[PDB]
Amino acid sequence: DTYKLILNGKTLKGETTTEAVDAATAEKVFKQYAADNGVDGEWTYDDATKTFTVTE
């Protein structure tokens, strides 16, 4: 299924999607995506919308 990441960093902001079999797999692309762009913050997830949010 399609999972989405709401990114709210200091220098980078936006939204990205990915295809994953479950939430766990989607978190571990999205929580590499954060690392990739030097984004370190607090995380939330919404199973109903399959949406991750990372905020710096």
Curated annotation (Swiss-Prot):
Compartment annotation: Secreted, Cell wall
Spans through the membrane: none
Repeat region (Sequence), residues: 2-56
Name the record gives this protein: Immunoglobulin G-binding protein G
Residues of the full protein shown: 302 to 357 of 593
